[PDB]
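Entry 0007
Protein: Protein CFT2
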Amino acid sequence: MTYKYNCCDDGSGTTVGSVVRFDNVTLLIDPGWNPSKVSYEQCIKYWEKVIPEIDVIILSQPTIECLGAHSLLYYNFTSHFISRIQVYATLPVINLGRVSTIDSYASAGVIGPYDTNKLDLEDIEISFDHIVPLKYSQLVDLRSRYDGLTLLAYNAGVCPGGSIWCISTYSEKLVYAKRWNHTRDNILNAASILDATGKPLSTLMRPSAIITTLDRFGSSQPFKKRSKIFKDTLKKGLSSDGSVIIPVDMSGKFLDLFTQVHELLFESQVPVLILSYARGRTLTYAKSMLEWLSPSLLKTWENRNNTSPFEIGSRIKIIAPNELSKYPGSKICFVSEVGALINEVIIKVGNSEKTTLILTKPSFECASSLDKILEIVEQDEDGKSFLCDNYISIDTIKEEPLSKEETNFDNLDYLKIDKTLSKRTISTVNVQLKCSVVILNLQSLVDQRSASIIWPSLKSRKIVLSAPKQIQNEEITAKLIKKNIEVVNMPLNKIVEFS
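Output (structure tokens):
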């Protein structure tokens, strides 16, 4: 009969949250944060006037763009959580969310033994420990306390635990989907929207409105095809003294791709390096969440010995950048796409011609260097290795002893404070790229065509898009507006009454 919607903006000009106001409930969906864009202080000042109004929080992806602000919110507004706010999320979103948060807060210096420390590692753990864990289809009955509020999570297929939310009240009903993959990938099943007959899920059928976005899409090619293309780029990358560097989101593409390079290695030594502030935790967590991955993947690896999809003999090595030297020749390197790490790696291996940079997506929000590297390639005229011959400005960190006045695979004590603090002194450096660069679209997201076809399969009158209009695909909007669907292009930070 009437409810309010609001796309939160902390100053980065993008949506860092969706607020839904129903008669007696105010829910916050996906409070994101991008440290490289908004500072810790600006982040706080933004949410300060928002938190006291929030009742329920829900997370739909383990990515910082969906849950990046949670630990900072929990730490800075603890009283509001201990008193009423309840955070709900899928198990994997909780667990990988704690790895994406660590890497992100670490890179930006929010946590760690630095003069800029704002909170501690144990603070991130405590924040996620307090999230109410869910399984897909597990009903969150809040009908008595919040006038018929029911929240249901379904498989969205982007990250393990990724989800699509079915929000309801005795009258209104919203289908939320920030990110979803219509097709399957190496480790996840397709989104639970449509089944093995293309018939839309029972519930979710007649939504008072669909809340989503249309600014990012996967390739129009089937997964199996994209998989082969990725596998080829690896063979050529490892060719000769071939060395490969793959920037990755530890809660996103990493687990997918790891599984794929594993399906190439143990099907024919070249080590697999993992540089992440969370170190080995992403692999551990993954090993304990098998019931969330597709059965196909699991059986594919069962047929072998008691081999997990996340283990490769004595291959895997968990190391830091100042240890890249130890591995001379061929080597596949997964680097957490966080600026503090990415930048140190490009500086150490970008000058070599025996290096092949594999970029899996259109842009990188936490690493300005990869975006700069994207422009150079796109500035020059399927899987071709563009050879670099260009200089680029890159910021580098040198940890200096804190004199400016102080007054095993999962172990992260190095991020805790003991007695050795230091300041991160930044300096801009120049690097001449001679490495090779490959650009693919391996994003486990729904392609443009499918989106315009599936979304209407729900007898929904409205589809609401977030963030600013400028990123919302004008193209697909037409098709939808054509198919008698009202499309509301949301503004930033402005409540909007719907019916």
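Curator remark: Residues 91-107 form the longest helix (17 residues). The radius of gyration is 22 Å.
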